[PDB]
Design a protein around this ligand. Structure first.
Ligand code: HEM
Ligand code: HEM
Ligand SMILES: [C-]#N
Ligand SMILES: [C-]#N
Ligand SMILES: [Cl-]
Ligand SMILES: [Cl-]
Ligand code: NA
Ligand code: NA
Lengths: 713, 713
């Protein structure tokens, strides 16, 4: 069946903004996962998970009688898709049970692990999501084997279809670098937003870079990919050595024995894949990565034996039974146990990427301090495990259950508690009036609040207006935010805040975070008034101001907008058309196509553009909230041509006279070009639409202002 | 950007069940198009459309100063995508403004027509849909030019994204037959469900079959494609000669001058396409089809000149300026006016497909009767134009406004008026009790009401339980309906109905249509009781019984289910996997993925399978309404394998003992295989889900029973 994507493979794809509809969701409209989880008996679930660890099923027998290692791997993989560049991947949506992740080669035989969990999932039903259960299982694995974890938060609601994520352009699973769709260029520079070295791997190649078993060069890959998943050197050493304290790899025979991944397997496979023709196809004969390494003398118990081995032997290159490169300690006794035969033992073994922890000079320092001080290793690993598995959960307000750690961590972009009475409706009205009396314009009000609120992304639920981090490094210095205009608005707002708070009785005060947003609301109300309409923009107080010391500046860098079509802003020249980047921003902000359309047409006429650009400002009454953008865009009396000086800028001229009326970018004109977006624009540019335009604009403005407000959830 | 469709191009695609979500719809949840249209001043719209006809725009100047021909073509094309095989296409959703239809080659320059309508659309806004406006404009064109139309109904709501329709498999626009994705095989047999001879054409090639200018063979293609769009010989002749009484074709220079279709054109083209480099690119120089034919001496006025010319001249093969095959009148004077230059005239011309109306022997008889009796021509054309443009609108209850024809037409599958009081709640309870006392089983009651209600399709809104057409030819005879078991149920229900009606006062009575559905409801209630649940199934009376004479048996043939996963029924062997046919049926019934899942799991255990097959009946308490289908499907204690005798039938055996537990089809097992369907199945197969399964089942049961109930809308 030939489709529109076949005919027009470069058209903009809007279906990403309409995933996750009520149509696909089996739960009722009013189902609230937090409510369900808060009555889960978490202790009973954890007891059932404990029992499961040592209850072997014959269709996938447990190594050493204990599934603990398999489940640690599972939870690590659930979390380990995460990229800091866009916040996409991570454990927070349970995407490992859908395509493509369920069938990535690095997730081979995690299908077995998930199926081992069905009886527990079944038993507790909607009170525990798969997303939460994946992580909880990792935790109970670690606990069952003697490792103290740092804590656990529930609240990851299940999703019901695949997310649309750019995982790379390769058409070949695991393709080595340098092909026609290479994710590398220059001096081994990985393309953003990617965080893995080959298509279908979590981070790196365990044999080494593109299969070259050099621990030193492997370390370069490890560092780069881990940094792109928000982990520094210390956390990366702790995570890798911590993980590889447990279980084993699987490479008992040639990989050609392993059949179709789950999305390709026969219907009779009932959602499982990688069926193996090698001997029994499982247990002692299992093949997963094609390596055959067991790291420690007690693979079902926490120990410091990974570093004892790493440093205590000299290593020699060898091959697994499937032919992969790995390392053995030849001068060692056979001290490592066999997974199924009590009468066999084995020499210690390591991956190339394990030896990176010793032969990279920076890693060696850390690994040596962990070797000598295993208590520091255990603490680092517990912290990093928590960070790994919670990194995409959002503000701590979303964290549920009895095990949440009380310690507030800098990575969480923390927000101070609010300890005092909030402003009321009357107070809000008095502040709006003071804001409008100060002289701040509609353009400044709306620009400032947009700049503060629109850092939110739904992918990892970082960002938004709470915290007033717009006044802090680095947000205050971002080009998109217009640092000098910003600094002037903030100074005026701070003066109004100081006066209002100074005049209060009884502990009442307002945060700068709330006032920034309230000020934006008053600018929207004033713009409506300028168009001859009286409206109230909703406002919910409760935001708090975070300090510079509560703000990790490096972590904040990935939230800088380098493209924001809602402010007609592009920081440099990109390979990707600006309209594509617009839909990507809309998706991150959780907006539908209609909400993206109304929002951008209003921002245009409110003066939200960076630099006061005239591009897309299709109105003679700037700072009035009207549907002018749509009416003028859609007027056939105007003809559009690309400019000689810049093919991404267009002139709109009177078709008869030739006189210049407007200019716009691709972001502006796409609304008059793409057949679905133009149909939307038509609704808002019709004669009967002024009331609808205003009401829908205020609703999506409010939505944006509240994106991070899980305290009101 | 590699996607899931890339990796797994044969997996089942569920996105078709979740189009048209509230996310993509710019109108609020409660916007009601019928109510808006009801307040439109239709007379004022029609006056503005009359004015528009002769208000020529320079960017697409009007032929003969009158856009009437262009607009009749536009409306014709809007309606002319319709196929009776599935009810897909047609004018009823305004899909011409979306991909791919907006860019089909046969809709070349209809982009101009639609843009000429933006001012009107804008002025009346949401009170008139584009879908209605396209057809209304056609009608006004006809009226402006002197033709009395049969009538007009509004009520076609706009849609907001492309429909998923199979238009063929060819990867080349307009590909000739016999290619690698040929829509033809054998003795020029067109594959169902297709109703056009080449990819991107409406019906046939105007030059002749595969470009061979043979009027006789062209006629065969015309008859076959028109029959596949629900038109007989009389209606086809009337439509073609009626249409080609007006306007002209456009082929002033080589087709190579014409550029990108709308979905491929630069952003500056602002939604338009097929820009031409030939001379002015428009008007006298326009190129659309590449033919240059003008049929009559008065192309802006209704006349009897089409048939006068057709029969009054002998025809000679020639070429247009673009090189296409067409026909010119031997020895004729230059009597046809030029569209732009008062001092030019032209000899009469015809297309190959126009000559089919004279050289096909069957067509000739009709064309000659129209030639001799122009009043008969005019009336048949008016009737067929109304049918063409209303064919996918559904029951007459959907028809809005002051111009609806009062005449009831056989094609409408008409339903008699209800003239008497309806049964109330007391009466419904008394009938249900009599139904359950008669002996009819849960299986019989549920199967019969499913068979009556599940004929509905949302594509053209034909079918459903209203009318009790299940008791008439041909439905009573359809294999899927189990004709002998059907006849027995109907006899028992007709006896109950007779007795109930006989005992009433004051003209109260119950239709057989209502009783069939009410009986099904009682069987669902009885099933719930058998499972120990107290449930009440909603029921809305008001259906009426249609007669055999109100029921065109040939037209009804396209509604026979040859595949119905919901009854585990497949009539023969198809190229398309049965799970694909399942989702297609779900789409026609308007079901989401969750509703398809719940509905099929319940029907299985209620005994709805054709022939009482045990396939998918994963319960030990058949006829009890439970979630057993899901719980048992998902039990990992059971292993599934295809049977030796039939690879589409599977055996489920105890994994330990080897003992046979169940058998299933691909329709059954897809729910335990496809990663999104298995996620849905899991919700309904969890321990806390029995009540949710029952409540969701009853909701979708009720939905299906009411699909045709536009009298309640
Ligand atoms: C450089 C980073 C990493 C590399 C290249 C890597 C590589 C591998 C490989 C190749 C396997 C064998 C899979 C199989 O054949 O069954 C494996 C197993 C394992 N990995 Fe990693 N790993 C890395 C990081 C981590 C981290 C961060 C964790 C957890 C914190 C983890 C925990 C484990 C566990 C527990 C297993 C054993 C699975 C079992 O017992 O079935 N790994 N690793
Ligand atoms: C066998 C079926 C038919 C064929 C092959 C056919 C073919 C054509 C072609 C090739 C054109 C020229 C398009 C152009 O270059 O602009 C055309 C024009 C037209 N057709 Fe048809 N046609 C068919 C049936 C119909 C029907 C059923 C109607 C309406 C009831 C219709 C009404 C018209 C009108 C009004 C025009 C003139 C457009 C104008 O003036 O711009 N045709 N037809
Ligand atoms: C471990 N992967
Ligand atoms: C006529 N198309
Ligand atoms: Cl994601
Ligand atoms: Cl359609
Ligand atoms: Na994410
Ligand atoms: Na249709």
């Amino acid at each position: 069946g030939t489709s529109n994507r076949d005919w027009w493979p470069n058209q903009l794809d809007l279906s990403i903004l309409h995933r996750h509809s009520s149509l696909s969701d089996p739960m009722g409209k009013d189902f609230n996962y937090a409510q369900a989880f808060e009555k889960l008996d978490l202790a009973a679930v954890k007891r059932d998970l404990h029992a499961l660890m040592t209850t072997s099923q014959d269709w996938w027998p447990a190594d050493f009688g204990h599934y603990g290692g398999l489940f640690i791997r599972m939870a690590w993989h659930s979390a380990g898709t995460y990229r800091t560049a866009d916040g996409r991947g991570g454990a927070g949506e349970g995407q490992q049970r859908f395509a493509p992740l369920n069938s990535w080669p690095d997730n081979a035989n995690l299908d077995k692990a998930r199926r081992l969990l069905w009886p527990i999932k079944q038993k507790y039903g909607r009170a525990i999501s798969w997303a939460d259960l994946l992580i909880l299982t990792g935790n109970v694995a670690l606990e069952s084997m003697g490792f103290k974890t740092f804590g656990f938060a529930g609240g990851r609601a299940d999703t019901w279809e695949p997310e649309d994520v750019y995982w790379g352009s390769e058409k070949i699973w695991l393709e080595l670098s340098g092909g026609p769709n290479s994710r590398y260029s220059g001096d081994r520079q990985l393309e953003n937003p990617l965080a893995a070295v080959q298509m279908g791997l979590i981070y790196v190649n365990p044999e080494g870079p593109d299969g070259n078993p050099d621990p030193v060069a492997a370390a370069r890959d490890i560092r780069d990919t881990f940094a792109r998943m928000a982990m520094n050197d210390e956390e990366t050493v702790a995570l890798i050595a911590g993980g590889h304290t447990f279980g084993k790899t699987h490479g008992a025979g040639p990989a050609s024995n392993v059949g179709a991944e789950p999305e390709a397997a026969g219907i009779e496979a009932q959602g499982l894949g990688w069926k193996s023709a090698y001997r029994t196809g499982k247990g002692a004969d299992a093949i997963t990565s094609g390596l055959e390494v067991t790291w420690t003398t007690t693979p079902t118990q926490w120990s410091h034996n990974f570093f004892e081995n790493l440093f205590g032997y000299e290593w020699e290159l060898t091959k697994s039974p499937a032919g992969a490169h790995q390392w053995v300690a030849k001068g060692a006794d056979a001290v490592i146990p066999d997974a199924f035969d009590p009468s066999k033992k084995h020499r210690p073994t390591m991956l190339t990427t394990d030896l990176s922890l010793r032969f990279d000079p920076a890693y060696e320092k850390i690994s040596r301090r962990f070797h000598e001080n295993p208590e520091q290793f255990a603490d680092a690993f517990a912290r990093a495990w928590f960070k790994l598995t919670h990194r995409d959960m959002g503000p701590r307000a979303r964290y549920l259950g009895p095990e949440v750690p009380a310690e507030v961590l800098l990575w969480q972009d923390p927000i101070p508690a609010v300890d005092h009475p909030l402003i009321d409706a009357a107070d809000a009205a008095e502040l709006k009036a003071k804001v409008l009396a100060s002289g701040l314009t509609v353009s400044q009000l709306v620009s400032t609040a947009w700049a503060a609120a629109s850092t939110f992304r739904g992918s990892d639920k970082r960002g938004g207006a709470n915290g007033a981090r717009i006044r802090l490094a680095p947000q205050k210095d971002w080009e998109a935010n217009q640092p000098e205009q910003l600094a002037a608005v903030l100074e005026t707002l701070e003066a109004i805040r100081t006066a209002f708070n100074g005049a209060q009785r009884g502990g009442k005060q307002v945060s700068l975070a709330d006032l920034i947003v309230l000020a934006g609301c008053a600018g929207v109300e004033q713009a409506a008034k300028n168009a001859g309409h009286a409206v109230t923009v909703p406002f919910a107080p409760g935001r708090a101001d975070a300090s510079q010391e509560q703000t990790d500046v490096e972590s904040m860098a990935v939230l800088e907008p380098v493209a924001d079509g809602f402010r007609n802003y592009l920081k440099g020249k990109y390979r990707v058309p600006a309209e594509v980047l617009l839909v990507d921003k809309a998706q991150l902000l959780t907006l539908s196509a209609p909400e993206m359309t109304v929002l951008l047409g209003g921002l245009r006429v409110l003066g939200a553009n960076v630099g006061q650009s005239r591009h897309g400002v299709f109105t003679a009454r700037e700072q009035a909230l009207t549907n002018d953008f749509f009416v003028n865009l859609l007027d056939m009396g105007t003809e559009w041509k690309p400019t000689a000086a810049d093919a991404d800028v267009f002139e709109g001229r009177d078709r008869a006279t030739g006189e210049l009326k407007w200019t716009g970018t691709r972001v502006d004109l796409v609304f008059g070009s793409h057949s679905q977006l133009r149909a939307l624009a038509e609704v808002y540019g019709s004669a009967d639409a002024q009331e609808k335009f205003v009401r829908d604009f205020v609703a999506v403005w409010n939505k944006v202002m509240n994106l991070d407000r899980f305290d009101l959830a």
